[PDB]
């Protein structure tokens, strides 16, 4: 009992929440937000 | 008719171009350091001379003695051109002493200012690689360079909008 339903069943809400946000990150919104993250840090460091 | 020989210094001259520019604090620094480091490390083989009249009215096919003399009261004889001319030679007999010398000049912001002259000196570019970190290095320095920064990126961008051969 404690096997298949707390064990397998975290198992399974892990996967499914991983899978999610694999799949919310390569949004465009997302994308966008961290392409000017990553601008962002490169004047940085020139500027440093 | 542009003969085919030129004269031209033997020892070619090394000028620092302004990211932006010269005469400004950003610019000073920029140039300074490489002065600095030519002078430290290479010392006993290179002279460092500055020059702070203008450089960019060398001119060999306009007259065969424009204001020879300072007596004349021509409107070129009491002009700012014999003194640059002038500097022109002098950079030729520290080239002759086969010692590498800088030129410091305060004026030439662009390659094209001085490449048509006799003088075919070395050109080095130090520039930022983008305009948005040139422009909060610039607001590093203080309230003193807010007012020329408007016309400082443009000597920036005319520039590096220059091709680079």
């Given at each position: 009992l404690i096997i298949i339903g707390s064990f397998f069943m975290l198992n399974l809400v892990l996967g499914v929440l991983?899978?999610?946000?694999?799949?919310?990150?390569?949004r465009v919104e997302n994308r966008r937000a961290f392409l000017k993250l990553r601008?962002?840090?490169?004047i940085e460091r020139e500027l440093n | 008719?542009?003969?085919p020989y030129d004269v031209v210094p033997s020892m070619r001259p090394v000028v620092l171009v302004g990211p932006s520019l010269k005469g400004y604090e950003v610019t000073d620094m920029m140039q300074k350091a490489l002065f600095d480091f030519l002078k430290h490390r290479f010392d006993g083989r290179i002279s460092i001379t500055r020059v702070t009249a203008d450089l960019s009215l060398a001119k060999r096919s306009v007259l065969n003695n424009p204001?020879?003399?300072t007596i004349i009261e021509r409107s070129s004889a009491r002009s700012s051109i014999a003194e640059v001319q002038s500097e022109i030679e002098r950079i030729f007999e520290l080239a002759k002493?086969?010692?590498?010398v800088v030129l410091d000049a305060d004026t030439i912001n662009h390659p094209a200012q001085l490449a048509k002259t006799s003088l075919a000196p070395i050109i080095v570019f130090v520039k930022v690689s983008s305009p948005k970190v040139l422009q909060r290095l610039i607001r590093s320095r203080g309230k003193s360079?807010?007012?020329?920064?408007?016309v400082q990126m443009m000597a920036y961008d005319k520039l590096v909008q220059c091709p680079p051969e």
């Open positions: 991983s899978g999610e946000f694999a799949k919310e990150r390569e601008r962002q840090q490169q | 008719h542009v003969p204001g020879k003399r002493s086969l010692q590498l360079q807010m007012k020329h920064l408007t």
